[PDB]
Amino acid sequence: PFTSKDTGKVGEKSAEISAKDTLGKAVKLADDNTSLKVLVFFQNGCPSCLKELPSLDEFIQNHPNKISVYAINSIDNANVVKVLAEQFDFKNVKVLKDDLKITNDRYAVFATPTTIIIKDGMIKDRILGEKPWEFFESKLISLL
At position 144, the amino acid (one-letter code) is L
Experimental method: X-ray
Q: Residue 121: CB partners within 8 Å, gap ≥ 6?
A: 1, 2, 13, 14
Cβ-count burial 91-107 (b if 16+ within 10 Å, e if not): eebbbbbbeeeebbebb
Which of helix, strand or coil describes residue 62? helix
Rounded alpha-carbon distances, angstroms, from residue 133 to 1, 7, 54, 78: 30, 25, 10, 28
Question: Which among 71, 67, 74 is positioned nearest to 103, based on CA atoms?
Answer: 74
End-to-end distance of the chain based on CA atoms, in angstroms? 20
Q: What is the resolution of this structure in A?
A: 1.5
Q: Give me the sign of the Cα torsion angle 140, 48, 112, 67.
A: negative
Gap between the Cα atoms of 133 and 117, Å rounded: 14
Rounded to 10°, the helix 52-62/133-143 angle is: 30
At position 8, the amino acid (one-letter code) is G
Question: Other C-beta atoms within 10 Å of 46: how many?
Answer: 22
